[PDB]
Amino acid sequence: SPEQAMRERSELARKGIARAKSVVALAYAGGVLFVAENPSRSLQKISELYDRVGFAAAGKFNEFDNLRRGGIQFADTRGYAYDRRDVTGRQLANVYAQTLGTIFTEQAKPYEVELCVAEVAHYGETKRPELYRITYDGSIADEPHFVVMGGTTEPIANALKESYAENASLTDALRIAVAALRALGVASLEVAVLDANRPRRAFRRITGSALQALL
Amino acid sequence: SPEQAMRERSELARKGIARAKSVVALAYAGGVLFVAENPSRSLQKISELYDRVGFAAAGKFNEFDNLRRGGIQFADTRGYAYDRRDVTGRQLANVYAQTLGTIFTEQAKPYEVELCVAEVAHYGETKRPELYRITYDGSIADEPHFVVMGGTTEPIANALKESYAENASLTDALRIAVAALRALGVASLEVAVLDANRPRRAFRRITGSALQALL
Amino acid sequence: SPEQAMRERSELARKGIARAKSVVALAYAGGVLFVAENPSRSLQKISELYDRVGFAAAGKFNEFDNLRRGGIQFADTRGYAYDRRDVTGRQLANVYAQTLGTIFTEQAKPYEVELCVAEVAHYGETKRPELYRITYDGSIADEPHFVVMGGTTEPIANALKESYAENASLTDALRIAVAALRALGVASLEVAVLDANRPRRAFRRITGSALQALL
Amino acid sequence: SPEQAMRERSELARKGIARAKSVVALAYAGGVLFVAENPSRSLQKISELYDRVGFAAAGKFNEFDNLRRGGIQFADTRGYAYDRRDVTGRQLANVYAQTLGTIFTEQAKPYEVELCVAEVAHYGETKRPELYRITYDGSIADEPHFVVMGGTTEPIANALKESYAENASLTDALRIAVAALRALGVASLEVAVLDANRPRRAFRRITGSALQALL
Amino acid sequence: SPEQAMRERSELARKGIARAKSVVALAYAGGVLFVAENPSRSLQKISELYDRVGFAAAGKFNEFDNLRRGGIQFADTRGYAYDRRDVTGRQLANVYAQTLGTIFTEQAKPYEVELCVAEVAHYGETKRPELYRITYDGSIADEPHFVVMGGTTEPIANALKESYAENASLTDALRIAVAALRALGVASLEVAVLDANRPRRAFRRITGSALQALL
Amino acid sequence: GQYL
Amino acid sequence: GQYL
Amino acid sequence: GQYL
Amino acid sequence: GQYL
Amino acid sequence: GQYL
Amino acid sequence: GQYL
Amino acid sequence: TTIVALKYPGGVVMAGDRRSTQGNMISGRDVRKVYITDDYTATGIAGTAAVAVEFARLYAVELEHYEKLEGVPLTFAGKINRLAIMVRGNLAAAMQGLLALPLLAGYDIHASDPQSAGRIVSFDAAGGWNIEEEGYQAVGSGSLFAKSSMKKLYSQVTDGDSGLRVAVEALYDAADDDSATGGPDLVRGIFPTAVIIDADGAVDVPESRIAELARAIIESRS
Amino acid sequence: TTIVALKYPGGVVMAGDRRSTQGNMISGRDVRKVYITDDYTATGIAGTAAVAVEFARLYAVELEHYEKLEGVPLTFAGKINRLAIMVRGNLAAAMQGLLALPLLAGYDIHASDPQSAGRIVSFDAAGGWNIEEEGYQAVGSGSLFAKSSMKKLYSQVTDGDSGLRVAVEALYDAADDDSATGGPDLVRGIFPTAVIIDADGAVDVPESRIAELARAIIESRS
Amino acid sequence: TTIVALKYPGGVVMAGDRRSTQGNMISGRDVRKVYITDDYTATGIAGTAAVAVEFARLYAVELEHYEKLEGVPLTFAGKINRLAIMVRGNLAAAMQGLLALPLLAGYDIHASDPQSAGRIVSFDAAGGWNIEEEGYQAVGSGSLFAKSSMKKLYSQVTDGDSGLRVAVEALYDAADDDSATGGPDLVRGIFPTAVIIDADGAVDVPESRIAELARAIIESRS
Amino acid sequence: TTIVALKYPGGVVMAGDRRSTQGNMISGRDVRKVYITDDYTATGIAGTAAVAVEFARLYAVELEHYEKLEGVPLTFAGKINRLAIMVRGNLAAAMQGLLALPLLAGYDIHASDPQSAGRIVSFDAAGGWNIEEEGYQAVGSGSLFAKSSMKKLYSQVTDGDSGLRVAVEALYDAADDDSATGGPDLVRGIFPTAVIIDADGAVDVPESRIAELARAIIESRS
Structure with a gap:
């Protein structure tokens, strides 16, 4: 049954997404803040899409990394x-x-x-x-x-x-x-x-003694 | 049987269409009028296909978006x-x-x-x-x-x-x-x-204060 | 079964044929008459295949429209x-x-x-x-x-x-x-x-007031 | 089974040609004589393959018609x-x-x-x-x-x-x-x-008044 | 079910991994040490990935050799x-x-x-x-x-x-x-x-008499 | 697909 | 059915 | 699915 | 695969 | 295959 | 099958 | 060669000569260079006669193809565009030597004013087009003499017949001024081709009227 | 030919001549070389008239296409970039004589100051663009004379009407200096075309006002 | 070389010489340059003999192929179209000296009057074709002398034999005037090839009659 | 057109003039040939203005692309290599006249000595790059005169401001020597643009400081 096949695909997607850590995005006064629980220090899940455009995703790391790269290259090409x-x-x-x-x-x-x-x-x-x-x-x-x-x-x-x-x-x-x-x-x-206060590139990471002090 | 699959596809089609947001189009004295009950301020199920040629559809947004883009490209090519x-x-x-x-x-x-x-x-x-x-x-x-x-x-x-x-x-x-x-x-x-009273481009969206005033 | 496959294919073709409107063409004194009951004021199932060659179809409109267009292309190429x-x-x-x-x-x-x-x-x-x-x-x-x-x-x-x-x-x-x-x-x-009393383009459409008068 | 598939294919073919007209090619003093059961007039089950080479098939029309075109074009290419x-x-x-x-x-x-x-x-x-x-x-x-x-x-x-x-x-x-x-x-x-006595092209259709007189 | 194939593939790869020798990588004072229990003197599951980047692999030999070669190619291409x-x-x-x-x-x-x-x-x-x-x-x-x-x-x-x-x-x-x-x-x-004390390329194979002296 |  |  |  |  |  |  | 086209109250007329040469020798004497493109358009092409015939054939083919494909003829800007497309397609060959200059006349059925429905469009080597506003135009080698004459002979353009006489006179004058253009041959009874377009459509002119008009004009010049 | 632009307080105006020529021979007298590119941009192209026409058509085509596809007009710089792309792509045609150099003006609807929202950008042979800061620009054969006169006349720019008068004066001067440029025709009633862009958009100037300006300027020169 | 074609009342005649040279020195004295195309058609090609033979073979093959594909021969206009297609395809190679100029004649069985069913069609370098109305035509190096004599001798054309004698006379005169064209070889008994087309069809003229006519002409001019 | 760059204790600064010409005529007066490539790197390109702008945009785009893809800025040498690749990709265009000579300066944040972190690299026609150890570098038509002046004045280089003064003096001298370079226009208040790169990043110089320095230099030379 293609109906059951698609249901199984969707439930598989739900299972894969559910078995992923929580990522939060909110628009505050000074712009938009991103926080991701990231036990890894090399891997990143929050990147910049464009000068005033940021990236956030949850799921399989390779998948959304490839998606990030595709979106970024298309955005660069369009700009x-x-x-x-x-x-x-x-x-x-x-x-x-x-x-x-x-x-x-x-x-x-x-x-x-x-x-x-x-x-x-x-x-x-x-x-x-x-x-x-x-x-x-x-x-x-x-x-x-x-x-x-x-x-x-x-x-x-x-x-x-x-x-x-x-x-x-x-x-x-x-x-x-x-x-x-x-x-x-x-x-x-x-x-x-x-x-938003940034002149061109709105994105900025927060880490190290900074992140420590802000919390 | 192939009939089973085809009728299944039809049932899937009109079930997706049934659980889809309702849009209507009216031909009135000044031309054609379109109303879509779209909560999304960004998404547009209605568009201009050409100067006096309009667009409206319902269903999966990516689907009819792709169809709109292809048709607009075709109309431009023809013109x-x-x-x-x-x-x-x-x-x-x-x-x-x-x-x-x-x-x-x-x-x-x-x-x-x-x-x-x-x-x-x-x-x-x-x-x-x-x-x-x-x-x-x-x-x-x-x-x-x-x-x-x-x-x-x-x-x-x-x-x-x-x-x-x-x-x-x-x-x-x-x-x-x-x-x-x-x-x-x-x-x-x-x-x-x-x-139709527009000289070249008949299309015109109506949003905001004018939309309130008419309604 | 291939026999079953052919039988069901023929059956679907013939049921699609039966579930369609009717059109009849006859050879009359001045040539060939094309008469159809087609409410669609914009979709036409009869077309001029060539100067002395006409067309008629019964079935799915897109299908035989595609066939008509391809045949017209080939006919023009041949001419x-x-x-x-x-x-x-x-x-x-x-x-x-x-x-x-x-x-x-x-x-x-x-x-x-x-x-x-x-x-x-x-x-x-x-x-x-x-x-x-x-x-x-x-x-x-x-x-x-x-x-x-x-x-x-x-x-x-x-x-x-x-x-x-x-x-x-x-x-x-x-x-x-x-x-x-x-x-x-x-x-x-x-x-x-x-x-045939047309010099070059034998095809001619009779519609509307002249058509009504002819009835 | 592949043997079952092939034997059913052969049965399909034999039912096809069996449920079809009959044509005969007979060598005689002047060459070879061809007689086909063609109630149709536009359709020609017999044709000329080359100047002294003839064509006669039996089955569904368009297949042997397409094959005829291919053999003739190859013959022309070879010549x-x-x-x-x-x-x-x-x-x-x-x-x-x-x-x-x-x-x-x-x-x-x-x-x-x-x-x-x-x-x-x-x-x-x-x-x-x-x-x-x-x-x-x-x-x-x-x-x-x-x-x-x-x-x-x-x-x-x-x-x-x-x-x-x-x-x-x-x-x-x-x-x-x-x-x-x-x-x-x-x-x-x-x-x-x-x-055979023809100088170059041996083929000749004998139809109508000539055929009637010969009949 | 696709999940069935996926899981069977998963334990397939897992049990393929299980039937393999043991390889270890560890960071120490002077950098990283690689140790493998490779009986074959010709075969090497360990290589250098770049001047400061090493290679460690275990599993089906030719597969990770392909991976090593492709990664080396890409790394050289980028360098x-x-x-x-x-x-x-x-x-x-x-x-x-x-x-x-x-x-x-x-x-x-x-x-x-x-x-x-x-x-x-x-x-x-x-x-x-x-x-x-x-x-x-x-x-x-x-x-x-x-x-x-x-x-x-x-x-x-x-x-x-x-x-x-x-x-x-x-x-x-x-x-x-x-x-x-x-x-x-x-x-x-x-x-x-x-x-790490190496000037440009950090990789080195310590094997044979040197390894014996180290042991 | 339409038949009419 | 086109057997001629 | 996305239907608006 | 990896959902980290 | 070769696991070494 | 042509076998002669 | 030289091919002409002028408008008149209620339509347009297109006409051209019959002479073909290869250098100084006369290769053609009864060349038909005016072709009824459709019910309301006709074109004449100056330059290489072979290319002219090919372009006429292909362009009529494209027009009829689109019409029957769509159940509706092209609009005036549409057919102009397609013709310009073809001309630009000849650009490489025109530089090579395969050069041809068309000229298009049409009756605008969709025009609000029936009287001013005539449409004459000229074309350049680059393929660009212009809608004529002087009411007259010509192409060909001696086109300068023809346009000069019809400059002075547009004062009496009043109907179809007046335009016919004026156009044939202009063709005669250009032939008098151009060796590559053929005069009306009384000896062989050959005369330049002409076509009338009106609200009723594009129609070929019977040879008799052209012949008598030419006879009258020649006698006047005598 | 020669086509001019200039910023005025509250918007920009765009104007060009009507003469098209072949060598020193006159082909056209009413050529419209200025085209309302969108609601707030218009352009004129100097060089080959056919190439200019097709560039105008094509560029407006991509503008409308992007607008419909994205539901939002392109930014001014984006339009500059696209136009630069297409003109650079035409380098191979330009070198073989198919030259057509455009000039783009437009009302930057997103400018912080409404009084300085007009933008004039000129283009080189290589396709390089420059936003003009002198407040005026011109293209075409006599563009030198027009810009030279406009240097003096820019002091008198105060509004739309002043810009109209000074621009048509510069066009008249260039015509007085350039044979390839056609001046106003009191006999044929043909005059250079002008278009005005402001916060309210791009609008064609009625020929009546153009004729008034031309007559006044001629009488002043008399 | 020189190859001719006259329309006698009742059909058409085709003939050509037998001389092939490479510069001033002779390669062929018995070259059949007249090829019976089909039942009611026959052509000859002037220029490079190899290219001519190749084209004759190819074009006959094309006609034969279409006939068997469709069970029906092409129309004369269609045959002209295919021949012109081949010629234009050749055009490029002919630019490198591979020049071949065909001449096509045929009997139109679909004509209203069987008396004037003959069809003589000429071609240019560009591939453009023309149907002859003077009733005679020639191709080849001495084609000028041929058509000039044909002008004066066409008055005597009343029967098929009349056209035969006239054509062989014209070929003889052209050879008398052109070194590149070969005259009747009395000592070798070689004479130009001629083929006749009528209601029965295209058939070759027996060489005995040709020699008779050649002897008669020589004696008359002796 | 001439663009210079100089290292100073604690960073580097690069500057260029504003004049663009088409031969001897002045085509531009306010050309910004200085571009902040990134936070710690900026460049200027001499030659074709269009190609220079295109290269600036494309190279900055590539740099940002890599930064976003990898989450890490490229090393200085990597940027050198990419820009050299880009230059070599324009070899055919340069040979046909699309010449563009970029000059690269940047602050090596990973340098052991913060004082000597400034990096200046010059390019050749073939695309070869060289890290300039003389502490100063320049490109453009008048580049030779700037080189000579910098040779003399590099003794006075002690800080950023001293480098600013000497660099603008060198630009003035090159303009005084080369016609194609635009001097500081007091009449229009237009002056060469400069950007300072140091440990905090690349910072554009305010025009007021440029103008005061230029006035001081002119008065000194008075």
Whole structure:
């Protein structure tokens, strides 16, 4: 039964995504903050998509790493094609949705990953930054408050909802995020920021004595 | 039996279409009017296919997005090849029907979408709008008055049928359309118009304060 | 079983054929008459194959539209390659038979369309107009008097057998044809003529007010 | 089973050709005489393969029609490559046997058809005209006296066997062939000859008034 | 079920791994030490990946030889493409994981191999060596003290965990390592070293009389 | 696919 | 059925 | 699936 | 594979 | 195959 | 099969 | 050679000569260089006659192909575009020597004003086109003399017949000024081809009217 | 030919002549070389007229295509980049004589200051672009004379009308200096075309106002 | 070389000489350059003899192939089309000295009047074709002298034998005027090849009659 | 057009003028030939302005691409190698005239000595690169004069500001020597652009400091 085959594929995707650590994305006052529980120190799951566009995904590391590389190369190609400002996270969001639905359909082994897209207005621009959550079957979600990735997203989404404070400060948003994801140590956690205050490249990682001091 | 698989594909198609957000298109005095109840501020199930050629469909967003992009490319190619006026929406409807029949017959997971295209006369030209509904299997039908997409088509379809008034004004058409569709809020609704009174590009989206004022 | 496979393929083709509207073409005094009950005011199942060669079809619109376009391309290629007068509808019938047998044997889903091929003598030239009846699988039949397509063939075919008179005028032929086809008002009817009295392009469509007057 | 598949393929083929018309190729004093059961008029079951080489097949039309085109084009290519006289009917028989064995092995639905080829000595040359019977499987047979194709082969073949006389006259051979075939009317029959006394092109169709007078 | 094939493949690769010799990589004062119980003098499961990057593999021999050759090719391609120092073993591990997950998913038979790579600091710079473990499915693991591989992993793993000494001497690391592996002679045993004190290329094979003296 |  |  |  |  |  |  | 086309109240007319040469020798005497492209368009091509015939054939083929494919003829900008496409396709061969210059006239059925439905479009070596506003145009070697004459002879353009006489006079004048263009041969009874396009469509001019008009003009010049 | 642009307080205006020639022979008298590229950008191309026409068509094509595909207009710099891409791609044609050099003006709708949202960008043979900072630019054969006069006349730029008058004056001067450029025709009533872009978009100038300006300038020169 | 074709009342005649040379020195004295194409068609090609033979073979093959493909011969226009296709394909190679100029004649069995069913078609270097209406035509080096004499001798054409005598006379005169064309070889008994086409079909003229006519012409001019 | 670069104790600074010409005519006056390639590397290219801009964009794009892909910036030598690859990829274009000579300066953050972390690399036509050990480098038409001036004035180089002064003086001198280089225009207030690279990154120089330094230099030379 193709119905049962697709059900089995979807449940396999659900199992693979659930057996992944929690990643949290939230838009605070100074931009958008990303925190990922990362026991590995070499592996990264939060990268920059473009100058004001950041990357977040959960699932199989190789899968979403390849997806990140594809999205980044396409974004670079598009920006070179027209302009640095002509690229919007919505564009690559649709591109990711297209390719994810594509691989889910054609490929026998699906990519059991859950990806999010966050972008910020350009420097000197006022705009509520936009969030895009894309599922394995090309299911895009424009979450207006906070994005939860991997594992049992229900408790973290609940704790984040109960304590979501719009326009929260860097440190306050960090505290809210860590309290929610707990519901740990300085290590094993990966954190980075899309800073609207940045002139061109909004992305910035947070690590070392910095991350220690901010928590 | 192949009949088993084919009817299974059809059932999958109209089940995906049934659990899909409902969009409607109306031909009114000033041209053609479109309403989609889209919560997503970014996603657009309706587009302009050409100057006086409009786009509207329901189903999986990536699917009809790809179809929209291909059709727009084809219309642009046709216009450049011969002329702007040489692009007739009837041709595009035929192209969409053939490609969707192709998808249905050969492509593994058929698209669970149903498409609409509308056409107004050129500026300073008199002609009734032409409405074409395109099914997942590729079936094409022409609606003299109105076309209803997505979800349970029967209730809203009957509502418009009982409440239709030909040559209705923009405001009257939108009021009756929203009244039937509710069977909503100013937000979560996307509307656009094929304005025959436009000199070259009949398409025009209506959002925000004007959308509130009309509603 | 291959026998079972062929039987089910033929059955699906023939049920698609039966579940279709009816069209009949006849050789009348001025040439070949094409009479169909086709409400679609925009989709046409009869077309000019060439200057003295016309077309008719019964089946899925996209399928035989594709076949019509391919045959037209080939016919134009043949005419340009050698000559307009060197092109014969018998050539086209052979080509279509090849293509239909091909699609029936190799394709997963064949085309459930039956066709008619009509040709008329050149201007100033006397000849019995030629009718070619080709089936889904490639069976070609030459009809000396009339060709009946679509749905329940038996009633209208018998009626024409008992109503057809050779050397029928436009009016007499059309009255006989509509009387047979009733086994409908002027609207929702599609009709055109291959007029040997045309110098070069024998095909001609009669529609609307002139059509109504002819009824 | 593969043996089961092959035997069912053979049964398919024998039912096909058995359920088909009958054609005969008979060598006589002036060359070889060809008579086919063709109630059709546009369709020609018999054709000329080369200047002294003839064509006669039996089965579904488009298959042997496509094969005929291929053999003729190859014959023309061979004649151009070396010479007109370098073309021998044995060449064509071998080529057809090769391709028919090929299609029988490879094709899911093989071309069910039975074919014969005739060759007559060059003008101003004496030689016993050559007849080759090639089956769908690819088995070629050389018959020195006569060839009978398709349908209920046994009664007509036996009747000719008693009634066949070598070096028979054109009229005598045609009347004998008619008698054998009856096992019908002047029309509905295809008549052509490989005529040895012809300077270059031995082939000639004998139809209508000439055939009527000869009948 | 696809899950059935996936799991059977999983324990297939696992049991292929089990039936393999034991190889260990450990970081010590002067860098990293590689020890393998290779009876064959010609065969070497250990090689150099780059000037400061070493190679460790176990499983089906030719498979990981292919991996070694491909990784060496890519590393050389990158070093020439950008710079010698621009090559980091993290990149190589990413590439290996990508291709490994690829072949695990798509290839009919996977590679029953495990991969480990050690990268040592450039000459004159201080940095802890990093050890990356890459299993058949591409699961990358960073083990900051030592990496075990092949056969009964548990006893030797426990032995090293209880016995691990940071900054162990070359001879001391050798002796503790051979003690762990016994949980043999200089022959049938492969030993090689990445020496951070080396100017450009850190790899070195310490075998034979030198190895005996070290033992 | 449409039949009409 | 095209056997002629 | 994504249906809006 | 690896979901880390 | 060769596991060495 | 042609075997002669 | 020289081929001409001028508009008149209610339609347009296209005409060209019949002479073909290869250098100074006369290779053709009755060459037909005007072709009814469709029911409402006709074209004439100057330059290499072979290329002209090929382009006429191919262009009519493309037009009829699109029309029957779509059940609707091309619009005026559409057919102009396709012709320009073909001309640009000749650019390499035109540089090589296979040079041809078309000229297109058409009656605009979709025009709001029926009287001003005539459409004359000129074409350059680059393939670009221009819609003529002077109401007249010509191509060919002696096209300069023809356009100069019809400059002064557009004052009496009033109907189909006046345009016919004016155009044939211009062709005669260019032939008087161009050796490569053939005059109306009374000895062989050969006269330049002409075609009328109106709301009723494009129609060939019967030879008798051309002959008598030429006789009148020659007598006037006598 | 010669085609000019200039920024004025509150927007930009674009204008060009109407003459097309073959060598020193006159082919066209009413050539429209300025095209409203979008709601807020228009352009004119100097060089081969056919190449210019097809470039204008094509570039507007990609603009509309991207707009529809992405649901958002391209940024000004993005349009600059695309136009540069296409002109650079035409280098091989330009070297063999198929030269066509464009000039793009547009109203940067995203400018912080509405009063300085007009943008003039010129293009070189290599395709390199420059945003003009002198507030005026011109292309074409007599572009030297037009820019030279406009150097003096830019002091008098204050609004749309002043820009109109000074631009048409510069075009008249270039025509007075260049044979290849066609001046205003009081006899044929043909005048250089102009288009105005502002916060409200790109709009064609009615020929009446152009004729008024031309007559006034001629009378001043009288 | 020189090859001719006249339309006698009742069909058409085809003939050509037998001389092949390489510069001033002779390679062939009995070269059959007239090839009976089909039942009602016969052509000869002037230029490079090898290329001519190749083209004759190829074109006859093409016609034969189409005939068997379709069970019906091509129309005369179609045969002209295919011949012109071949010629234009050759054009490139002919640019390197591989020049071959065919001349095509045929009897149109589909003509309304059997009396004027003969069809004479000429061709250019470019491949462009022309149907002859003067009723006579020639190709080859001395084609000028041929057609010039044919102009004066066509008045005497009343029967098939009339055209035969006229054609052989014209060929003789051209050979008398062109070194590259061979005259009737009395000492060798070699004479130009001639083939006649009528309602019966195209058949070759017996050499006895040709020699008779040649002797008659020589004696007349003796 | 001439672009210079100099190391100073604690970093490096590079600068270039603003003049672009097409032969002897002045085509541009405010050309920004200085580009911040990244945080600790910047470059300027001499030659074709279009090719220079294209190379700047593409090289910066490649650098950012690698940075995002690998999460780590390239080593200085790696950037040298990539830029040299890019230069060599333009060998054919340079030979046909698309010449572009980039000069690369950067702050080696991984250098053992922070003071000597500045890195200047010059390129040849073949793409060969050289780390300049003289502490100064320059490209462009007047590059020779700047080299000579820097030879004299490098003695005074002590800090960033001293390097600024000497570099702008050298640019002034090269402009005084070479016509193709634009001097500091007090009339238009346009001055050569410069960017300082040091341990904190690459920082553009304010125009006010440039203008005051240029005024001081001019007064000194007065």
